[PDB]
Amino acid sequence: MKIEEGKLVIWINGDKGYNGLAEVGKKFEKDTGIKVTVEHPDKLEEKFPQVAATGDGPDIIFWAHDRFGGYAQSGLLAEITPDKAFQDKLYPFTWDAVRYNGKLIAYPIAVEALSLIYNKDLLPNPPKTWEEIPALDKELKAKGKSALMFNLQEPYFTWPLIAADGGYAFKYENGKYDIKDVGVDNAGAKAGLTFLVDLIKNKHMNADTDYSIAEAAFNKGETAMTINGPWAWSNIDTSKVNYGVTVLPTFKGQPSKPFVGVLSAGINAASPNKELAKEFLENYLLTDEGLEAVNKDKPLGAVALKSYEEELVKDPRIAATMENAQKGEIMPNIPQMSAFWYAVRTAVINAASGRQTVDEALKDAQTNSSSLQNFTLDRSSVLVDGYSPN
Amino acid sequence: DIELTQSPSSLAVSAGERVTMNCKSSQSLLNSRTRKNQLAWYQQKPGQSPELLIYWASTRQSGVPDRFSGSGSGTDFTLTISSVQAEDVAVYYCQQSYNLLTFGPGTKLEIKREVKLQESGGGFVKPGGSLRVSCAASGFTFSSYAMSWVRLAPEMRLEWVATISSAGGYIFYSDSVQGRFTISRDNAKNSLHLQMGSLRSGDTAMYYCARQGFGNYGDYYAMDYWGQGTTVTVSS
């Protein structure tokens, strides 16, 4: 229950550039004397609301914005106070992603979307469409290679194919999400997931595939294509596979529609250092030099900060990220997103593993996503002197 | 901090008799917000895990025959079986949920003429030793539910041990185990655990994992599914 005054503790995921961020920390230290400690706890997207509930945890938490509505409703997040002058340094759509009840609850950092990453040597002309991948694998199997391998354990990676033809999470109508209009059941959703399963049935993919299997598969040059975000680039860089980053294949003539995540920095509600956090975030991290220190450790992709994005977008890989970003949809941040992810994660794994048909798997995911009247997030089911905790 | 008495402690009836069981608490259990009384009733038939009968004092759980009936207000609660039957031989427990969780001492009733939860990992230990009990969950969105550990000790003693919230932020232990025990969950592997250290011989019991129920009308503040008890014996 103590966060410790006069110090900044920052949490950020392990695939991001925490050492780069840590050096922004050291710069902050020599300028102000405040010590900055960067940690990358595992599953920090769940570790955070778990420790922050009783007022413990880091001063600053990084994740895609989707989870931040959820944290905010649980009161785990401070309202941030950037003046109009700082707000203009960033693209307006990124601020829209950090809103909850009209209030800004985090600082946007990077704009993330999955792209198609291909081995240029194995495959000089990557597929425009999902449909031509099965035949492209047969060819590649003849030379002891596969066409495509990406993470199937995380619905984030499988969502772009599901939504291509009209699958959607919650319907966005007149400025608001309608949590009774759920589209994980519709024909577009089923068309995508059926296609992914048929890929697995015809021995072109393994239901078995997870992030680190697919990564090593691509970085060892054994598969021609992978699907991943900018974070994955640095491991591909060191491996010296000759790789390109480009548009995701179309499905049924429609673009794949990745869920765009705005990587964001939140300030713990329970933190005694909310001013030191604002200053670090506004004056050190969200500067050209700040974002570059992180970026040189592990690429952020496109960034919310205008001045630096204009430099980064010159890189054909970031151009690709943006193009894919523009063809997708910005994720909701509503508290129910947690329920949804769990739901789709289950549907994707059970349909792909065979334990359920596509129709059964998505019907379940749709049931588990729909009547979420006052979905809670951290349900304690306990009273303390006749009252709930928090 | 809340004490519960149940009268009578045992009871022998012929088939068909109407039966009333008492439960009294050291203090009022009324939820100032929901106006529900934080009292629930459980049935433990011989050789089985307890099951939910009544919650919110007077609401019958789905599946429970309507001869079971809960009533009461203030500090005074009653479970009535209008005309008892052979299948009702069981110990009956009131449980309060107004301030943490406490089970009553129980009423032994005798007659004279896809939601699954599986525990694992019980065993023997010397006093001061260790064990970690687990409970694997299936048939529901485990991520959405608070889970609790309850243990049954040799002298008809049903005890709450710990509860962990659906996302783990809120954890609570019985005095009897505070410090020595640690309740954890893994929402990714659909799993609940109780690390038991510095074991007393009084910690010897069957240990149940139980799901805290809720619905469209609010939290049940009651446990609506139980696993079979894994057994923990601390033998001097």
Residue numbers in the entry:
A (entry chain A): 0 to 389
B (entry chain D): 149 to 384
What wording appears in the published article?
Mucin 16 (MUC16) overexpression is linked with cancer progression, metastasis, and therapy resistance in high grade serous ovarian cancer and other malignancies. A humanized, high affinity antibody targeting the proximal ectodomain represents a potential therapeutic agent against MUC16 with lower antigenic potential and restricted human tissue expression. We describe the crystal structures of a single chain h4H11-scFv and describe its interaction with MUC16ecto composed of 26 residues (31thLQNFTLDRSSVLVDGYSPNRNEPLTG6th; numbering from TM) to understand the binding mechanism through the comparison of the apo and the MUC16ecto-bound scFv at 2.36 Å and 2.47 Å resolutions, respectively.
The complexes were crystallized at pH 5.0, which is a physiologically relevant pH inside an endosome or in an hypoxic tumor environment. A complete structure of the complex was built except for two regions; the linker domain composed of Gly-Ser repeats and the C-terminal 7 residues (RNEPLTG) of MUC16ecto sequences, that have no visible electron density probably due to high structural flexibility. A structural view of MUC16ecto revealed that it is composed of two consecutive β-turns of 31stL∼F28th and 27thT∼R24th residues and a β-hairpin of 9 residues. The β-hairpin is a simple motif that consists of two β-strands, oriented in an antiparallel direction (the N-terminus of one sheet is adjacent to the C-terminus of the next). It could be stabilized by two inter-hydrogen bonds between V19th (-N) – Y16th (-O) at 2.8 Å distance and V19th (-O) – Y16th (-N) at 3.1 Å distance, respectively. To our knowledge, this structure of MUC16ecto, composed of 19 residues is released as the first human MUC16 structure and the first retained ectodomain for any tethered mucin. We observed a dramatic conformational differences including reduced interactions and a new hydrogen bond between Q115 of VH and S197 of VL at the interface area between VH-VL during ligand MUC16ecto binding. In particular, the sidechain of VL S180 was moved ∼ 2.5 Å, forming hydrogen bonds with Y16th and G17th of MUC16 (pink highlight). Y108 (VH) underwent a significant 3.3 Å shift towards MUC16, leading to the disruption of previous hydrogen bonds with VL residues (T182, Q243, and S245). Three water molecules (w1-w3) contribute 5 pairs of hydrogen bonds through bridging D106 and Y108, and S180 with the MUC16 ectodomain.
